[PDB]
Design a protein around this ligand. Structure first.
Ligand SMILES: *[C@@H]1O[C@H](CO)[C@@H](O[C@@H]2O[C@H](CO)[C@@H](O[C@@H]3O[C@H](CO[C@H]4O[C@H](CO)[C@@H](O)[C@H](O)[C@@H]4O)[C@@H](O)[C@H](O[C@H]4O[C@H](CO)[C@@H](O)[C@H](O)[C@@H]4O)[C@@H]3O)[C@H](O)[C@H]2NC(C)=O)[C@H](O)[C@H]1NC(C)=O
Ligand SMILES: *[C@@H]1O[C@H](CO)[C@@H](O[C@@H]2O[C@H](CO)[C@@H](O)[C@H](O)[C@H]2NC(C)=O)[C@H](O)[C@H]1NC(C)=O
Ligand SMILES: *[C@@H]1O[C@H](CO)[C@@H](O[C@@H]2O[C@H](CO)[C@@H](O)[C@H](O)[C@H]2NC(C)=O)[C@H](O)[C@H]1NC(C)=O
Ligand SMILES: [Ca+2]
Length: 475
């Protein structure tokens, strides 16, 4: 059973790898409907680098070696497009570092290319060096959109919460591996203004802060609180840094605890028609916005991780409720895949969806699915933490729903409406996180235990970045 399911995930991943190599490699990604290529990530081959940690875990040496040969030829100092510090960090930087830790440890005997392996760190060093000038600002809070050749930017006055708060894991990890503390220092300085929020009006509830920070002085510029896009991974990394080195980041852990508790006390929300369902809402100067995103479903998995590590049954319980809410958005549609955004405000329910809202508990705002993994991710933590089979099965139903709805001759495509036969229409798009996240969590849920699997209590020896790349925990 489980062995056959794991093998079936490997097949789906292999299917996409073949089409990508066939029509697009070395470009960043495959365009799955026209069987062509695109470069949404600066042209360094994002799908190939993102695919590395997953291939190593699945045991596909051919795929690993092809990727290792490709890394050696990349020139991170050249690109014809503007650069996102955040995306470049969570996909490229973390993808090479994870491969190195995986190949230098639990997977040492997978290939003979020690020289190409060593180069994964060398290239990680070079990428950080080309990017670091982004941090050289008054406060230390960076510009997320830079031009790596002129050193110019988009002229922004503020930098977002998530884009500022989701770099410390990979940047600190490079320092611990090279011995050059500059990376750990630059990223931690930017992270500092987020742990000690100012003005106080920008921290409406303990541990929940605004969505923008002035690059000039480090002060927040708004008081909007949320776990949706723009904010999300900031809270995610607070706890994960504690798992990385509980010694050095006990303070991060303390800031996450406050955030978790204020969220249970204020952001928690139950739709009027479906009181047994739970979602998180947004908050702005006393008003609660009752809508969420697929992205936000990463939330249950964070509560479950902080829950088992800190032996807090109340966080584990709250996490499972968020998992149920997200499962609900999935099994309520025709394809069995959930929507990008939705709402549950009794005063705004669309008349055409009246019937649907009444039974499911929500109304759909954007019915597309861009091959995202946030829900499978959290379904994966619930199964690892509780040990219940129901969560493993929910990962399989989702995986199968995607394979039948999104698959094409070359790979998988995003779709326009999860509540229409075949998903409406397919988008000519396949993001690299299809290889990094969708295929890794689906596989890990049915595969054998190992060091890279998420663990209970304080037993974790690896810690996943936001793009599903596992990093060896410090010392
Ligand atoms: C489509 O999507 C829906 C919505 O998510 C799925 O239904 C949910 O399924 C989960 C998983 O079983 C349900 O969670 C479990 O609910 C049990 C019953 O809870 C009711 O009764 C208790 C009485 O004490 C009340 O407290 C509670 O408010 C409810 O009224 C619980 O007993 C379960 O907890 C036990 O197991 C967990 C581990 O899984 C432990 O942590 C607990 O300590 C305890 O041992 C668990 O909470 C959930 O209730 C369902 N939600 C809804 C809204 O129905 C469907 O299954 C899915 N359909 C398909 C096809 O998959
Ligand atoms: C990044 O900055 C460089 C500036 O060095 C921009 O490149 C210049 O673009 C002008 C526009 O025609 C050319 O005439 C120059 O010859 C270019 N200079 C060099 C050395 O290439 C580039 O446009 C910027 N990139 C982006 C995406 O805005
Ligand atoms: C994922 O989709 C693939 C392709 O649609 C499924 O594999 C096909 O299965 C049919 C029988 O149902 C075979 O006749 C084809 O030869 C298979 N295609 C290929 C190229 O392998 C696959 O079963 C689906 N995965 C799961 C777990 O349902
Ligand atoms: Ca993520």
């Amino acid at each position: 059973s489980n062995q056959a399911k794991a093998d079936a995930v490997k097949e789906a991943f292999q299917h996409a790898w073949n089409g990508y190599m066939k029509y697009a490699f070395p470009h960043d990604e495959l365009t799955p409907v026209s069987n062509g290529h695109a470069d949404s990530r600066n042209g360094w081959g994002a799908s190939a680098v993102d695919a590395l940690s997953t291939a190593v875990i699945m045991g596909k040496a051919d795929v690993v070696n092809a990727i290792l040969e490709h890394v050696a030829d990349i020139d991170f100092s050249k690109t014809s497009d503007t650069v996102s510090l955040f995306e470049t960090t969570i996909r490229y930087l973390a993808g090479m570092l994870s491969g190195y830790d995986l190949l230098q440890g639990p997977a040492k005997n997978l290939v003979d290319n020690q020289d190409l392996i060593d180069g994964l760190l060398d290239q990680s060093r070079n990428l950080a060096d080309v990017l670091k000038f982004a941090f050289d600002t008054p406060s230390g809070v960076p510009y997320n959109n830079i031009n790596i050749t002129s050193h110019g930017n988009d002229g922004a006055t503020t930098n977002g919460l998530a884009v500022t708060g989701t770099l410390v894991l990979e940047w600190t990890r490079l320092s611990d591996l090279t011995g050059d503390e500059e990376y750990a220092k630059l990223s931690q300085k930017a992270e500092s203004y987020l742990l000690k929020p100012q003005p106080s009006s920008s921290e409406p509830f303990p541990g929940l802060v605004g969505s923008s920070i002035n690059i000039n002085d480090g002060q927040f510029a708004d008081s909007r609180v949320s776990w949706n896009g723009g904010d999300d991974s900031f809270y995610e990394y607070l706890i994960k840094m504690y798992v990385y080195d509980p010694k050095r980041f006990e303070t991060y852990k303390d800031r996450w605890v406050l955030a978790a508790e204020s969220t249970i006390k204020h952001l928690k929300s139950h739709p009027k028609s479906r009181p047994d369902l739970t979602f998180l809402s947004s908050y702005s100067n006393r008003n609660y916005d009752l809508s969420s995103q697929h992205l936000t479903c990463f939330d249950g998995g964070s509560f479950l991780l902080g829950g088992t590590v800190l032996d807090r049954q109340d966080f584990i319980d709250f996490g499972l409720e968020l998992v149920d809410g997200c499962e609900a958005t999935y099994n309520s549609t025709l394809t069995k895949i959930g929507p990008d955004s939705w709402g549950w405000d009794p005063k705004k329910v669309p008349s055409d969806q009246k019937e649907f809202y009444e039974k499911a508990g929500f109304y759909i705002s954007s019915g597309s699915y861009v091959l995202r993994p946030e829900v499978i991710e959290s379904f994966y933590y619930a199964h690892r933490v509780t040990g219940k089979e129901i969560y493993r099965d929910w990962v399989w139903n989702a995986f199968v729903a995607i394979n039948s709805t999104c698959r094409t001759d070359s790979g998988f495509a995003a779709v326009s409406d999860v509540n229409k036969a075949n998903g409406g229409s397919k988008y000519d798009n396949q993001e690299s996180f299809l290889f990094a996240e969708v295929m890794k969590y689906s596989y890990l849920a049915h595969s054998e235990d190992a060091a890279w699997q998420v663990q209970k209590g304080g037993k974790n020896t690896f810690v996943y970045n936001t793009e599903a790349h596992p990093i060896s925990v410090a010392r």
